[PDB]
Amino acid sequence: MRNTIVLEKDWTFYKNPQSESGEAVTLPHTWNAVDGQDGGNDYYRGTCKYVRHFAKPELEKGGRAYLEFNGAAMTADVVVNGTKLFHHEGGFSTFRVDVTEQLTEDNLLEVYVDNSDNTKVYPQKADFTFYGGLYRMVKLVTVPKVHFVMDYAGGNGMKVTPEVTILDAAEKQADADVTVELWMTGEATDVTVAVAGETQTVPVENGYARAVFALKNVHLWDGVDDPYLYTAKAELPGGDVVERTFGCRSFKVDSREGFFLNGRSYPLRGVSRHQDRAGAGNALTYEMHREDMAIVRELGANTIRLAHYQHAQEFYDLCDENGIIVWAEIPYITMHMADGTENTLSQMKELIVQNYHHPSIVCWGLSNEITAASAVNEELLENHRRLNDLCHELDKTRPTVMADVFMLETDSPMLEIPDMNSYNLYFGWYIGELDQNDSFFDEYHSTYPDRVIGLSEYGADANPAYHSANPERGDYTEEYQCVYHEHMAKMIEERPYLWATHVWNLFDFAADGRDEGGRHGENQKGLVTMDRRIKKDAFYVYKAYWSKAPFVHLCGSRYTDRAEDVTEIKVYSNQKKVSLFVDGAEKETKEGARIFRFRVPITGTHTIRAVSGDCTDEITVRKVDEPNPDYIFN
Amino acid sequence: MRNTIVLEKDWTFYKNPQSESGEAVTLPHTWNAVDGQDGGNDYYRGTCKYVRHFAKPELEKGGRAYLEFNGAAMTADVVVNGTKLFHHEGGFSTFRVDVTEQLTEDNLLEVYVDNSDNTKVYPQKADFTFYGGLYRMVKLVTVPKVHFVMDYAGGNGMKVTPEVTILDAAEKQADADVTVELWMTGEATDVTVAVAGETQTVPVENGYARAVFALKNVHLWDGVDDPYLYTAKAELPGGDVVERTFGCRSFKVDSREGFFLNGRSYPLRGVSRHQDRAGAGNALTYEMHREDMAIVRELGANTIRLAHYQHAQEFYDLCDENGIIVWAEIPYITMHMADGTENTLSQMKELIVQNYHHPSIVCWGLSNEITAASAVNEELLENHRRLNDLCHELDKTRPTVMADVFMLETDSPMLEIPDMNSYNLYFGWYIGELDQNDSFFDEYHSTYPDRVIGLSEYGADANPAYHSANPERGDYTEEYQCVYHEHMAKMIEERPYLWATHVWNLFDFAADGRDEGGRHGENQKGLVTMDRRIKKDAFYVYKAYWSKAPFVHLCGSRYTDRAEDVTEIKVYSNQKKVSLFVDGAEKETKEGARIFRFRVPITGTHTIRAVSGDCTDEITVRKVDEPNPDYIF
Ligand SMILES: Cc1cc2nc3c(=O)[nH]c(=O)nc-3n(C[C@H](O)[C@H](O)[C@H](O)COP(=O)(O)O)c2cc1C
Ligand SMILES: Cc1cc2nc3c(=O)[nH]c(=O)nc-3n(C[C@H](O)[C@H](O)[C@H](O)COP(=O)(O)O)c2cc1C
Ligand SMILES: [Ca+2]
Ligand SMILES: [Ca+2]
């Protein structure tokens, strides 16, 4: 009886809302896919208008019709048949609009979508393009007269809470009390709730129902090796149905020993991901989400920081289904603005209500680098206490965290507010030397041994066009990014008290204000390029640390022209032995772990082949008289 | 300094050793690839001759040259430059021949290979074709004067033993003492051993050396999710080098609770596999081994019973590398013969010596269905006790087992000999009803609760060309094989005390005496056809039980013409919900587990689409007036 149709086709988009003619578009859509990815700090920001018609949907007697917007960046006004019905501030979360009373036979839908600079809607100051438009789907949902609530913060009127007790960690034996709370409109009598083959019927009172299932020997959601998911289903006499997937897992974060999953140590070692891509902008299809996740899996990252905003349900689903552990946050970022305080609380409420069921999520992020351009005063601290309190009020099952900028003094009162802290560190890239990452954490953990500390950002830019036999910080070479991550990976491996670490970033991403490292409009800290077509050499150092799929990878497949008489051939591998062949003749076999380095005298054009068991790779190395200038940013 | 050359090309095969002209072949080779797969109980058995030349290889002063045979089925006689040098009985194990003193610049190699019927070399009575020939590679190996022994039972002079102590099962924390024992000739004074990035020099005394490595926090070999492997490497003065991969794992078998790995319950649920394939015979390439394992992995089986003989080193390696737990055995099968007793002990020694290092292997099988055609008497008992004692003498780290024919009474003295037992049961196919599987094991386990019991064979024949809406034991339909395996799967799930279960068989396989189920020369109990091209529908019942890779499978993709007005549509899947679409129209969503059954009215030609999440499958069904007679045996 609950029916959904996608309002995907037959839109007309008006860049100038006042123009007589527009352009045909299909959702998802953004108007900044080109001008937000090419540099110049000039992508178009303002109010634009989407228009489309839709026919009156079939409705039960006293049924309702809702428009569902899953992503309208950043501020949306919904006008139906010339009446304005909704105003939404928050470009990353679902909202819905009851349009029943305005329905005629043919309905005019005008959506004004705004991504302008203002002081009321985060984000406003950040290192990523603020793509405007209807970049996620718009839907028309019809419900019976008695229905699960549709207007509360983009939720679905269901709140499922699995509380897990580990009985035998090694056997994965656990019990679970699963609470299903529901909220309903209309004069309902009772509701039926189905969980794990059991069924209960409970009374509705004041639009609210509750059911607890005491499950024994539940099948744990246990990370990448067994991401088992359950389904909770609630159904009303009149026929309305809602459901959430959920997973059963316990976890804790020990300030000294790190993250624990289901009674066992489970160090979180992964990356971050922005929700855009070359060409498409943030108008991502499902296949694009899946491809991003398939690259996560090949990499073997077991956690993703989904900065800096609520991501698509499809991607959180993918994390659920793949056993990936997620850090989720709101775009409370860089510069505090007093007029945005309510927007921070509104986006946090929608984030938690709409994502509370995802077992992949283990923490709520309050803000990112918020003291990069804010004085630490009572106003700032208050905004953070209110967000912290809201997280704890809505969700007893996850801690709060925030990502701190490296200038924030470690004794600031800011750090005492959330349950955990992670620092964004760029020592050895933006500032100082690589060693300062190690010392920063040794000193924090020595001063504050009872605090949980992590590494929420770290990286260095690499343009796969640039190379050097003597990489150094700032040459933007593929080789220095390897040097940087080789050091960070060892530094992290030495420090099991880091609760989670996240490479910034898995992918290059659009930042229209950047014009650095030979590519206009892109942050090049990705381990993979923005079009997902090139995995940079530094991707494979992490694959060597993380992946269990045997591989060998020769670095320098783009460092072909080499002026030096003896060159380093570097192989990344999760095997323990590698054999190098030069022009078909075996030159040397080394044992080791992860990183294998060979000295090769070169005199002409050579075919270099690396072998370990059944795994092989091959590159060309070509001696030249003078360094190739195309490899040089200078 | 140790060098190996493959003698693969430029052979001449003489099916009649007395005939002046023959057939140029390349190894691997068998002369039975065609006539052992087509029925008639008539493939050629006898002695055949392989001839090749090879150049004298480069040898250090006092170095040695060995011909290495990895598989000569079944009896080989090796003659170099007219001198008879070696006689080997056993078609499934490596042996080596010192040819040093007969070398000249251009060397003649003649190998007589015999797969004849006799009372000396097992196997002689079994349900599989006894392919003859050099069906695995022949190599020329040269070593320095001081070298690890080459002539001890096809081993390489290294015996590596990890003793694992589990410190914390949930954390996978464990220590292991790794003992490396070495045998060598040439009177070197010491040897250097490398294990896990450590090295150690120990003395050589009377051709033997021993080094112990006390590893802490080893990376456990932990089954399919993490088959981590180490290397033991030894190096002599003068340059000779041998090595063995090994894994660190502890395991135990509980008669009530089943198999345990690295401190946790790890029920062994899987398949068997014969080392042959359509067209190639048993002359398999490396890629054929890899494809077989790729199919094991898709299926999700975590154990393989490698019946009925020693398999290729490459395939044992694949099991090591993929975390597959293995049952290994010798072809002491069906019919005891007094003059084959020494051959059972020779093959078992070679099996253990050559495969002791494989962490995948967890038990040694003494015999299969040996009482199918043997009286249980003191002589039969003694042969088994001697095999049992040899396993225990050579290997303190693995239990023995045997596969019992279903006629063998459960109080027989035979059952008291091995450490564990498994029965080959075909209730519901060969005899009796499906329920008798359940009660056979109930009654055994109730009577002997302290004994380890398992299921070493079970299955039903299925010809993918045959189909029926009302399958019956004996119609050979793809659909009855699913009915059979649906029952067996549920029976097995109810009985955690079954230490291991093994579907007979992963693949159809050649049995030249069989003329059954519309295919001559093949046993059709495979879950996959013999050419590896068609996975029968019962394959996907197990994949729904075992695989974690999401999938949806429609049965009946070969059951296309159906006479019924409302036909049954069965989907196998490891998902929780399956939606069926007919001609594009969504028609029904069912929740459930493993097996999803739909009822679909059919009037003409329809397209049936099954969906769950991103997983899709599709078949075509055509309503007909009369049953297609091709679907009927
Ligand atoms: C996932 C989730 C969904 C929720 N859905 C509803 C809902 O539909 N209706 C409701 O009244 N409360 C819902 N709640 C709970 C309220 O947010 C909670 O009681 C809160 O403290 C009420 O605050 P408010 O009434 O000011 O919005 C939900 C909570 C969670 C975690
Ligand atoms: C894997 C493995 C390899 C062995 N290799 C040799 C060897 O090369 N030389 C040797 O004298 N014994 C070797 N042994 C010797 C064992 O002591 C021997 O097989 C058994 O105890 C007695 O052997 P025997 O009766 O043939 O002397 C090996 C044992 C194993 C398990
Ligand atoms: Ca621009
Ligand atoms: Ca034949």
Coordinates of N, CA, C and O and ligand atoms in Angstrom, one line a residue, chain B residues 148-153 155-161 181-184 207-208 244 349 352-357 390 393-396, ligand 2:
Chain B
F148 N 71.5 -32.0 -0.4 CA 70.4 -32.6 0.4 C 70.0 -33.9 -0.4 O 69.9 -33.9 -1.6
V149 N 69.6 -34.9 0.4 CA 69.5 -36.2 -0.3 C 68.3 -36.2 -1.3 O 67.3 -35.5 -1.1
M150 N 68.5 -36.9 -2.4 CA 67.6 -36.9 -3.5 C 66.9 -38.2 -3.7 O 65.9 -38.3 -4.4
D151 N 67.3 -39.3 -2.9 CA 66.8 -40.6 -3.2 C 66.0 -41.2 -2.1 O 65.8 -42.4 -2.1
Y152 N 65.5 -40.4 -1.1 CA 64.7 -40.9 0.0 C 63.2 -40.6 -0.3 O 62.7 -39.6 0.1
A153 N 62.6 -41.6 -1.0 CA 61.1 -41.6 -1.1 C 60.5 -40.4 -1.8 O 59.4 -40.0 -1.5
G155 N 61.1 -37.4 -1.3 CA 61.2 -36.1 -0.6 C 62.4 -35.3 -1.0 O 63.2 -35.7 -2.0
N156 N 62.6 -34.2 -0.4 CA 63.7 -33.3 -0.7 C 64.7 -33.1 0.4 O 65.5 -32.2 0.5
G157 N 64.7 -34.1 1.4 CA 65.6 -34.1 2.5 C 65.3 -33.1 3.6 O 66.1 -32.8 4.5
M158 N 64.1 -32.5 3.6 CA 63.7 -31.5 4.6 C 62.4 -32.0 5.2 O 61.5 -32.5 4.5
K159 N 62.3 -32.0 6.5 CA 61.1 -32.3 7.3 C 60.9 -31.1 8.3 O 61.7 -30.9 9.2
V160 N 59.8 -30.4 8.1 CA 59.5 -29.2 8.9 C 58.3 -29.4 9.7 O 57.2 -29.7 9.1
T161 N 58.4 -29.2 11.0 CA 57.3 -29.4 11.9 C 57.0 -28.2 12.8 O 57.8 -27.9 13.7
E181 N 64.3 -30.5 10.2 CA 65.2 -31.6 10.1 C 65.6 -31.8 8.7 O 64.9 -31.7 7.8
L182 N 66.9 -32.2 8.5 CA 67.6 -32.2 7.2 C 68.4 -33.4 7.1 O 69.1 -33.8 8.0
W183 N 68.4 -34.0 5.9 CA 69.3 -35.1 5.6 C 70.1 -34.7 4.3 O 69.6 -34.2 3.4
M184 N 71.4 -35.1 4.4 CA 72.3 -34.6 3.3 C 73.4 -35.6 3.2 O 73.7 -36.5 4.1
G207 N 75.1 -37.1 8.3 CA 74.2 -36.8 7.3 C 72.9 -36.2 7.7 O 71.9 -36.1 6.9
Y208 N 72.8 -35.7 9.0 CA 71.5 -35.2 9.5 C 71.8 -33.9 10.3 O 72.9 -33.8 10.9
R244 N 60.8 -25.6 1.9 CA 59.4 -26.1 2.0 C 58.6 -24.9 2.5 O 59.0 -24.2 3.5
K349 N 54.4 -44.1 2.6 CA 55.6 -43.5 2.9 C 55.9 -42.3 2.0 O 56.2 -41.2 2.4
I352 N 53.5 -39.4 2.7 CA 53.8 -38.6 3.8 C 55.0 -37.8 3.6 O 55.1 -36.6 3.9
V353 N 56.1 -38.5 3.2 CA 57.4 -37.8 2.9 C 57.2 -36.7 2.0 O 57.8 -35.6 2.2
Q354 N 56.4 -36.8 0.9 CA 56.3 -35.8 -0.1 C 55.3 -34.7 0.3 O 55.3 -33.6 -0.4
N355 N 54.4 -34.9 1.3 CA 53.4 -33.9 1.5 C 53.2 -33.5 3.0 O 52.3 -32.8 3.3
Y356 N 54.2 -34.0 3.8 CA 54.2 -33.7 5.3 C 54.1 -32.2 5.5 O 53.5 -31.7 6.6
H357 N 54.6 -31.3 4.7 CA 54.7 -29.9 4.9 C 53.5 -29.1 4.6 O 53.4 -27.9 4.9
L390 N 52.7 -46.8 10.6 CA 53.6 -46.0 9.8 C 53.2 -44.5 9.8 O 54.1 -43.7 10.0
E393 N 54.2 -43.3 13.1 CA 55.6 -43.2 13.2 C 56.2 -42.0 12.5 O 57.1 -41.3 13.0
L394 N 55.7 -41.8 11.3 CA 56.3 -40.7 10.5 C 55.7 -39.3 10.9 O 56.4 -38.3 10.7
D395 N 54.5 -39.2 11.5 CA 53.8 -38.0 11.6 C 53.0 -38.0 12.9 O 51.9 -38.6 13.0
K396 N 53.5 -37.3 13.9 CA 52.8 -37.1 15.2 C 51.8 -36.0 15.2 O 51.2 -35.8 16.2
Ligands
LIG2 C1 58.9 -35.3 5.4 C2 60.0 -36.3 5.8 C3 61.2 -36.4 5.2 C4 62.1 -37.3 5.6 N1 63.3 -37.3 4.8 C5 64.3 -38.2 5.2 C6 65.5 -38.3 4.5 O1 65.6 -37.5 3.5 N2 66.4 -39.2 4.9 C7 66.2 -40.0 5.9 O2 67.1 -40.9 6.3 N3 65.0 -40.0 6.6 C8 64.1 -39.1 6.2 N4 62.9 -39.1 7.0 C9 63.2 -40.1 8.1 C10 62.3 -40.6 9.2 O3 63.0 -40.9 10.4 C11 61.9 -41.9 8.6 O4 61.2 -41.6 7.5 C12 61.3 -43.0 9.6 O5 61.3 -42.6 10.9 C13 62.3 -44.2 9.5 O6 62.7 -44.3 8.2 P1 63.4 -45.6 7.6 O7 62.7 -46.8 8.2 O8 63.2 -45.7 6.1 O9 64.8 -45.5 8.0 C14 61.9 -38.2 6.7 C15 60.7 -38.1 7.3 C16 59.7 -37.1 6.9 C17 58.4 -37.0 7.6

